[PDB]
Scaffold this active site. Sequence first.
Site, PDB file in Angstrom:
ATOM      1  N   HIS A  46      41.798   8.447  14.223  1.00 32.17           N
ATOM      2  CA  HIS A  46      41.073   8.696  12.982  1.00 32.17           C
ATOM      3  C   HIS A  46      39.612   9.116  13.221  1.00 32.17           C
ATOM      4  CE1 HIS A  46      39.450   7.445   8.907  1.00 32.17           C
ATOM      5  NE2 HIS A  46      40.419   8.294   8.609  1.00 32.17           N
ATOM      6  N   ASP A  91      43.002  10.537   6.406  1.00 27.90           N
ATOM      7  CA  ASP A  91      43.154   9.190   5.863  1.00 27.90           C
ATOM      8  C   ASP A  91      44.615   8.801   5.657  1.00 27.90           C
ATOM      9  OD1 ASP A  91      40.366   9.066   5.916  1.00 27.90           O
ATOM     10  OD2 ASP A  91      40.155   9.385   3.762  1.00 27.90           O
TER      11      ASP A  91
HETATM   12  N1  LIG Z   1      38.513   4.982  12.073  1.00 24.43           N
HETATM   13  C1  LIG Z   1      37.802   3.901  11.696  1.00 24.43           C
HETATM   14  O1  LIG Z   1      36.836   3.513  12.371  1.00 24.43           O
HETATM   15  C2  LIG Z   1      38.185   3.176  10.472  1.00 24.43           C
HETATM   16  C3  LIG Z   1      39.449   2.785  10.161  1.00 24.43           C
HETATM   17  C4  LIG Z   1      39.378   2.107   8.920  1.00 24.43           C
HETATM   18  C5  LIG Z   1      40.357   1.516   8.112  1.00 24.43           C
HETATM   19  C6  LIG Z   1      40.019   0.936   6.927  1.00 24.43           C
HETATM   20  C7  LIG Z   1      38.688   0.907   6.515  1.00 24.43           C
HETATM   21  O2  LIG Z   1      38.452   0.326   5.307  1.00 24.43           O
HETATM   22  C8  LIG Z   1      37.208  -0.263   5.027  1.00 24.43           C
HETATM   23  F1  LIG Z   1      36.241   0.740   4.901  1.00 24.43           F
HETATM   24  F2  LIG Z   1      37.317  -1.000   3.847  1.00 24.43           F
HETATM   25  F3  LIG Z   1      36.963  -1.130   6.088  1.00 24.43           F
HETATM   26  C9  LIG Z   1      37.683   1.489   7.294  1.00 24.43           C
HETATM   27  C10 LIG Z   1      38.025   2.093   8.513  1.00 24.43           C
HETATM   28  N2  LIG Z   1      37.300   2.730   9.489  1.00 24.43           N
HETATM   29  C11 LIG Z   1      35.923   3.009   9.446  1.00 24.43           C
HETATM   30  C12 LIG Z   1      34.924   2.059   9.214  1.00 24.43           C
HETATM   31  C13 LIG Z   1      33.591   2.466   9.166  1.00 24.43           C
HETATM   32  C14 LIG Z   1      33.245   3.804   9.335  1.00 24.43           C
HETATM   33  C15 LIG Z   1      34.238   4.758   9.563  1.00 24.43           C
HETATM   34  C16 LIG Z   1      33.902   6.218   9.751  1.00 24.43           C
HETATM   35  C17 LIG Z   1      34.396   6.782  11.099  1.00 24.43           C
HETATM   36  C18 LIG Z   1      33.544   6.284  12.249  1.00 24.43           C
HETATM   37  O3  LIG Z   1      32.338   6.354  12.208  1.00 24.43           O
HETATM   38  O4  LIG Z   1      34.102   5.758  13.344  1.00 24.43           O
HETATM   39  C19 LIG Z   1      35.561   4.353   9.593  1.00 24.43           C
END
Ligand SMILES: NC(=O)c1cc2ccc(OC(F)(F)F)cc2n1-c1cccc(CCC(=O)O)c1
EC number: 3.1.1.4
Length: 122
Positions: A46, A91
């Site tokens: 992701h 997503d």
């Molecule tokens: N691939 C991921 O890291 C990621 C997977 C995931 C799943 C649910 C989620 O739900 C919530 F927001 F309620 F927690 C959030 C999630 N994230 C996330 C968290 C913070 C930032 C980013 C942007 C991407 C980045 O900078 O790494 C993604």
Amino acid sequence: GILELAGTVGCVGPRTPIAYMKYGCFCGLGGHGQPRDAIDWCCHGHDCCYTRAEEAGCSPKTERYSWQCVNQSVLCGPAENKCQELLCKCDQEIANCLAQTEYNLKYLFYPQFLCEPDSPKC
Ligand SMILES: NC(=O)c1cc2ccc(OC(F)(F)F)cc2n1-c1cccc(CCC(=O)O)c1
Ligand SMILES: [Ca+2]
């Protein structure tokens, strides 16, 4: 955007999207290292997808898009532009990925100092 990310993940899977806010080395803002488990691999994938989206001139954290939750499955659209399509695809894919995983509680709030500086390629 983040709103849709939480929503899509919640739609498909069995757990609160909060369960992925800080998990392993990749689930959460940024991420580096060897993925700890299946969930962490999904988040690595992701992160890669969002990077590609940013390189395509989109804003994956903020851009709104339309989607529907039908039978715990994400359907993307209607899309007004390619960025909305791309973000929903990212997503949808992580939501599908995470729904097929077992949760390992031990990786929730895993210390970043255990995550190696280098990561698998996208
Ligand atoms: N691939 C991921 O890291 C990621 C997977 C995931 C799943 C649910 C989620 O739900 C919530 F927001 F309620 F927690 C959030 C999630 N994230 C996330 C968290 C913070 C930032 C980013 C942007 C991407 C980045 O900078 O790494 C993604
Ligand atoms: Ca991440």
